[PDB]
Subunit: 207 residues, 2 copies
């Protein structure tokens, strides 16, 4: 037709994009209190997270076999959507907090929060401190004296492939960090945390 | 055990909230689509262009159907959950207005309804539509012979046309228009919601 129509169709599209974010915010606002109440019940189920993480179909493929003993110490996982804090954040942005009860003589009891947010878009993050297990001293990047050597590079990559390497993932150095750090982050915010109860129930039906 | 009971209740609330969010979206989008479609009724061959621009739509119908699809000057999808709580938020009706082709395809408006039956599957009911005279030999309601090898070929040809799709129900696997459910979702999930995008993309080329 003419231009006058193409214009109306232009403003309509912008009204649609605005509606979509309003809808996402609407959902986030409604779900926040339900998660709080749900997580209160979860905090009363020992090894809830260990069971959920084992039931997930692909979680295990992201971390090293040896990491599981440390993952088993997770007492709580909490995901919070940042768009609820400010419209300056994408509705896909979230922080994830882990509480590890630790292992005497090997892994420190600690709480760690990592923040994921969209840039220019793709998920990105900043490194967050976490006390690696003593067992990992030889593959720990901050204790790694020899990274250059062909034997050092091997150990370096090994450490970077552990869940602890994921905590320093940023998404800004393609191929240089923990592999698929963004996919793992999305796994937590879109599948593991939202549907943990469904996974747990499934593990129950299996006696 | 009181925890498991609490979790069960939370999951129930989650499902209730998801429906509420979907209805919230549907209600907000309704007036926008109405205004949008008003501007659309001002662009000639709008739908003809969108349907030819879509990447997979043409793969669902027969080449011979293109000329009839080109006569569509109006497509309207309506979500039934806005009508009642007994409809799934995925249930919808799609209304087509064909301008027709004189002496071959009658000018007509047809509405087909798609609804979930049990996470459930999309189903529909046959809806009346006047097939083109050119399709007389492959029209299931006119064919006398649907048994011979030749009669069966003509039968299948007709059932694979867009007119056979209006007859699709999703309740007779392997006996109806192929992938009638995917085509339906194409309309409600891509073609109708993003038609304007397809129209702009067609302008550049």
């Amino acid at each position: 037709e003419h231009a006058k129509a193409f214009l109306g169709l232009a403003k309509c599209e912008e009204e649609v994009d605005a509606i979509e974010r309003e809808v996402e915010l609407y959902r986030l606002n409604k779900m926040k209190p339900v998660y709080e109440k749900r997580d209160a019940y979860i905090d009363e189920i020992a090894e809830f997270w260990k069971i959920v993480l084992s039931q997930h179909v692909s979680f295990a493929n992201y971390i090293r076999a040896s990491d599981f003993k440390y993952m088993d110490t997770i007492d709580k996982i909490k995901v919070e959507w940042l768009a609820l804090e400010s419209e300056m954040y994408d509705t896909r942005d979230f922080s994830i907090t882990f509480h590890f009860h630790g292992i005497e003589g090997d892994f420190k009891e600690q709480q760690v929060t990592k923040v994921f947010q969209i840039k220019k878009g793709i998920l990105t993050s900043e490194p967050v401190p976490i006390e690696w297990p003593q067992s990992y001293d030889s593959i720990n990047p901050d204790l790694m004296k020899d990274k250059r050597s062909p034997e050092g590079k091997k150990k370096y990559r090994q450490g970077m492939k552990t869940i602890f390497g994921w905590f320093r993932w940023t998404g800004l150095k393609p191929g240089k960090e923990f592999p698929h750090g963004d996919s793992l982050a999305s796994l937590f915010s879109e599948e593991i945390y939202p549907f943990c109860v469904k996974y747990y129930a499934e593990a129950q039906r299996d006696l």
